[PDB]
């Protein structure tokens, strides 16, 4: 197959030029990544970075020193302090790295985005690759060219930590959305990244948001067809937009460390799709195959399992010392040479493609004059807008009107930590409205635009402070609730905020999915004043509700909007906004009854021979794609050709969408597949495409979405793509179509 | 290559299958191939209008005589009968088969716990509580009495042992099988083979009847919880876990074996060649006869759409290596298969293989000499003192004391006893599903005479010093059970001034009875009138022994702190409460062990064979991991009146290779005051592996008997291929490296001195 990114003469003369140069030391040092803390002393440490980089020959650095977000000054001047030293004593720049991850995480003042389970939400490619050029931008100004991002992980489990770092529960979301972020990161040339653009990293490939129990860095257990059609799907295409690096899964599947998978790492990933960037660890796992999964011995050992697998830099993340352990390894046998310079090569390869032995620094104090802007927050808060789910909206309560006395309660009404999650300035996110108090809560937005008089805020329940691990994330408590309830009667509707407080990984792992017991426990309490409630659903992860969701006329899941979430969500319930976001996974309503939308028909209630309305009612609190505007769209008149078709077609499907209402809103328009009969029992629906239009009241267009015959083709029992001669069904809205493949294809080659 | 026959070549036996296939024309193999139940053999309308079960000679002519149907099953109206309403049924039945066809009926019953379907029948502990056993000898004794009783019946074969993996606690069929582990149901489903069949597979006698593992395989591993939802198990546990049971009971020659009607990797087991035809028939080359699961053909089509009509999916399961079609209703399934062998859907020689296998099955019985046989006469022990004896026993070995602080437990002369909760006066509680009726929601009305625990605890410690008031209690089932999970406050204050009246409170809690699909929950959690019940127990201040009654472990985390004992009686049969009352009042001694893994949590789920990674604090170097955050109780639980001490751990040789046999001693001392029993379970840990290694795996167990201070050496072998390992690409290997052998707390290092890759596809 053509590579992935494209050939390019200049390029790898400039790598092979460079590597014949190179020492063993200096090879070794490429391949070995540490933290910011060995060179700190914010201050650095100058006697550091010339022994770590001076005399270990360290190649690349990450993570916000302190572990804490930092401003761009203080980034720039470490980096300078960083590139004066590689240029000199190697000849070769330094490579930074930051998990830049919804917007800048790690840099102060920049601008903060919803994460990526809400541009999940958003249906909308544009504005997902807006907010990660928005990002390139904003981390260039801090002299960092890499983020390691996009994560693009099914959500296959709703207890797990991580749920809220990916696009969602489904294959093609997480594809299309990853593609779009690795698109604003890098801009339109894989192999020239300007000064405006940073490399993307691909994460956690694969499968890690598939463990069994839930539990982060738990072994998964993925069925041969899962893991080509469904977990590999998304790495595969955005690989195919030329993305210049991958970060493997820390975790295990089958017993096999992905670290140690050399299958996976070589020859799924590098040889098959013929991709020449570069494989780097996640945090410290070359440690965890000995000292974790006792797949090794020693270090030694493990350091030579995963570079000979295919991993190219190790995130150690401490220890020079790494450099030593793998030329132990070439001087003993352990690793080829030929391994090395492949690995060196493919490092070499990416510094050449972000300028940096050219521009190893640039004019971070001129060229940058946007990063915080007034106009990149307009952007974050429409991602943020375009999020927010109408679960339910019985009544019309929702929009609120003039007049209307509003309460708002709950533990996630007055806090920005609550609107961010983790990831945001610290990695648990847990000092959020400690860092960065200038941005506006649920509570300050909805007292901006509905007037001080008009809004009350009494919680009822209370999030503490955050220890320093965040061990109390999970806990909330009752704070007069009497006083509560007191000013709910005295106001004409409550919206209550609820969900989780900040997380992050291992120790964000939940043992029981049900929202808390306090909160539970607020909302039947302002339930018996009989005001209307307005239920807001503030989370990461989406944790049962279904004994308050009777209790509320209207419910909106806000997600993770970030800074400008509470801005988003009062120009919504006021009517200024239209909601168009739809759900990215499946709601869960009970603790052992998960599911995901794309289930096999004996999953299905009471669905009879013949029939493909297949019912999950009773285990769904809300499906995939759950969502209502204030507006009501009419989908008609479904086409699709040629409606016989074989593998080699294109299929033209055209749907007619009127905004029927009195509002001017967006509708996203989804498009499902069922496969009717098939050698594998076929999901019961899946989401072949998407797009999202803006309709004026009345105003009818036709939605055209050209679907290739092979998107039809599924992953067979033997692990190979194959296309089955018969029938489908197309769906959008309430519309469905019948179309026949006239003839099987089946694939001899690993991808369609 | 080829490994020796499953079961042993008898030349006469193929002469006998070979004669007798060669006369037959297809309507008769076909025929052969086609089993339904008894009801397209019973007179509805008759039956209704007497009550009784009245058959249909009519129908026995139609089905058996025009449509050769081979195989018929199940109790009639699915409801228990006695041995002579079954006996006269299938008389009728023979005199047809024999004088139409030439070929005896085969007649199956899943007899799943002794006589399930046989009013009057022993009635044992589910497989669960004889997984909690860890005694193989108890095991194939309940399953001879079992082949006895069933044969009263004159019925020769039962769909048994069920040996299914039980790896997720919502699974409404967790209790079939003997628990969570690949070793336990390996072994009891090898003795359970034993104990059904005798010794010899190609002939068995007329006290004994062809056995049936079950549900081939991985049946047991729903992603999500519910049954004939998809698994999804990883190519190395699918081989080394879900396969070594069905493995291990082939070797001992099981005549038959059924199919998962379920799903794994989008695949239905029903039409999966690879699994049914080539690693089970022809690897282990076992010449058997393998039986589709109830409608599972059907499914094919209707359920899963792998097939677009019926005659496809019997073209694709016949195909695939099935041998007999549970129908279960249609005779036009003989109609169907003709058509797929007259437009080539289906070789002849895979029809005259699948018949070779049934009529295999049906001499090995000795059904063609005697179809029929003198029931009235030759079972004199049925339902007989002795064989309650045997049923008793295995309840008692089978209950699990999982706490008792203070010296609670046992019970003493002149405590005012209070039986509360709604398990404590139910046959039905007792034995859960497959008891009489299908979902077990009718045993104390078919079933009155057998003791529920209040009952047993009223004769045992007095009727004056026992009383009975539930506070809570289950409503009687509809005819669908779809009210099994409810439960009901029943004047709790009433039952509270009862308990301050009472010396120590016996609050038995749990679920009520259920079968498959129709038992599905969504919450692990315990009921919650149940756990109300126990918690407002509990303020009366009076002591509580908690007694858990149910198929699967509910959680109790937040009733046990109040429990001063805890005993997990899971579903222990007709003779449970008998055996409960003997254990509360210490003419028993509590021996039983855990089988699974209790879980504490609805959303932290595991078992004990779990990777290193999920172990919470464990250092390099360390093998001593930790999972009591998420666990209720591990895995092995179980305490007992008296104490053991274990000691000596040794092992020749402790340098081995692949051809070695490991001889395993280690000493064990009752150093408490009461003479008990003691299981003994061995385990393993492979300190580093190219798979991550499972933290613990049990090897070998035994069970002993021990007067206190009496210590005792107990002998355990392990071949050395027993540490070997599935790995990454699907085959065992024994890795060069050492090893851990634990016995209780004590522990030992040995050293594999070479590795050994496999080629072939079991050891
Ligand atoms: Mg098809
Ligand atoms: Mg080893
Ligand atoms: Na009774």
């Given at each position: 197959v053509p590579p992935a990114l494209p050939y390019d003469a200049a390029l790898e003369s400039k790598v092979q030029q460079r590597l014949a140069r190179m020492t063993l030391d200096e090879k070794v040092g490429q391949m070995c990544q540490l933290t910011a803390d060995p060179l700190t002393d914010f201050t650095f440490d100058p006697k550091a970075i010339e022994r770590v980089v001076g005399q270990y020959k360290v190649g690349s650095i990450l993570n916000a020193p302190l572990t804490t977000a930092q401003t761009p000054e203080a980034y720039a001047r470490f980096i300078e302090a960083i590139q004066k030293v590689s240029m000199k004593q190697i000849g070769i720049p330094n490579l930074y790295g930051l998990d830049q991850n919804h917007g800048t995480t790690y840099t102060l003042g920049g601008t903060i985005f919803p994460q990526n389970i809400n541009l999940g939400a958003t249906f909308n490619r544009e504005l997902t690759r807006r907010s990660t050029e928005i990002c390139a931008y904003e981390t260039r100004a801090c002299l960092v060219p890499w983020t390691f991002n996009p994560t693009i992980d099914l959500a296959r489990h709703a207890a797990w930590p991580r749920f809220w770092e990916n696009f969602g529960e489904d294959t093609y979301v997480n594809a299309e959305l990853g593609r779009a972020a690795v698109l604003g990161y890098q801009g339109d040339n894989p192999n020239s990244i300007d000064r405006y653009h940073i490399a993307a990293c691909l994460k956690h490939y694969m499968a890690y948001g598939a463990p069994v129990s839930g539990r982060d860095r738990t072994p998964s257990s993925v069925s041969r067809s899962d893991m080509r059609e469904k977990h590999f799907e998304p790495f595969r295409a955005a690989v195919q937009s030329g993305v210049l690096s991958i970060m493997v899964n820390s975790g295990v599947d089958n017993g096999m460390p992905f670290h140690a998978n050399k299958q996976l790492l070589?020859?799924?990933l590098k040889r098959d799709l013929n991709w020449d960037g570069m494989l780097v660890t996640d945090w410290a796992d070359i440690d965890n195959l000995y000292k974790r999964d006792r797949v090794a011995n020693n270090k030694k050992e493990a350091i030579a399992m995963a570079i000979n697998a295919?991993?190219?830099?190790?995130?150690?993340?401490?220890?020079?010392?790494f450099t030593d352990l793998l030329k132990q390894c070439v001087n003993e046998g352990l690793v080829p040479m030929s391994r090395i310079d492949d690995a060196v090569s493919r490092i070499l390869r990416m510094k050449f493609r972000l300028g940096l032995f050219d521009a190893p620094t640039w004019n971070w104090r001129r060229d940058?004059?946007?990063?915080?802007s007034a106009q990149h927050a307009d952007v974050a808060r429409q991602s943020a807008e375009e999020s927010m789910v109408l679960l339910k909206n019985e009544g019309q309560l929702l929009p609120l009107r003039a007049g209307q006395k509003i309460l708002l309660a709950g533990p996630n009404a007055n806090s920005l930590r609550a609107l961010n999650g983790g990831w945001t300035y610290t990695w648990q996110g847990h000092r959020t409205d400690e860092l960065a108090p200038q941005y506006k809560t649920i509570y300050e937005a909805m007292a901006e635009r509905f007037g001080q008089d008009k809004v009350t805020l009494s919680q009822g329940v209370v999030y503490p402070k955050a220890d320093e691990a965040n061990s109390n994330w999970a806990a909330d408590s009752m704070a007069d609730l009497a006083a509560t309830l007191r000013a709910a009667q005295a106001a004409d509707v409550i919206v209550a905020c609820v969900g989780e407080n900040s997380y992050c990984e291992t120790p964000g792992n939940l043992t029981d999915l049900h929202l808390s017991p306090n909160q539970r426990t607020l909302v039947k309490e302002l339930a018996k004043t009989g005001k209307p409630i307005v239920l807001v659903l503030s989370e990461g992860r989406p944790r049962l509700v279904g004994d308050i969701e009777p209790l509320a006329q209207s419910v909106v899941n806000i997600m993770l909007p970030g800074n400008h979430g509470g801005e988003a969500l009062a120009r919504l319930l006021a009517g200024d906004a239209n909601f168009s976001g739809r759900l990215p996974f499946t709601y869960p309503r009970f603790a052992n009854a998960l599911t995901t939308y794309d289930y096999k028909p004996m999953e299905s209630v009471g669905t009879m021979e013949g029939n493909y309305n297949y019912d999950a009612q009773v285990y769904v609190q809300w499906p995939f794609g759950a969502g209502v505007s204030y507006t009501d769209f009419a989908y008609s008149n479904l086409r699709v050709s040629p409606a016989q078709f074989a593998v080699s077609d294109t299929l033209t499907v055209q749907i007619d969408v009127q905004n029927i209402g009195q509002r001017v809103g967006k509708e996203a328009v989804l498009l499902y597949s069922h496969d009717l009969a098939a050698s594998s029992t076929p999901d019961v629906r899946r989401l072949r495409a998407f797009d999202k239009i803006e309709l004026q009241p009345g105003e009818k267009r036709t939605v055209t979405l050209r679907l290739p015959a092979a998107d039809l083709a599924f992953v067979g029992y033997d692990g190979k793509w194959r296309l089955e001669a018969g029938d489908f069904l197309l769906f959008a809205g309430n519309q469905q179509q019948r179309i026949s493949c006239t003839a099987t294809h089946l694939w001899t080659t690993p991808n369609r």
């Open positions: 070589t020859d799924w295919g991993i190219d830099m190790s995130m150690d993340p401490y220890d020079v010392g940058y004059p946007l990063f915080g």
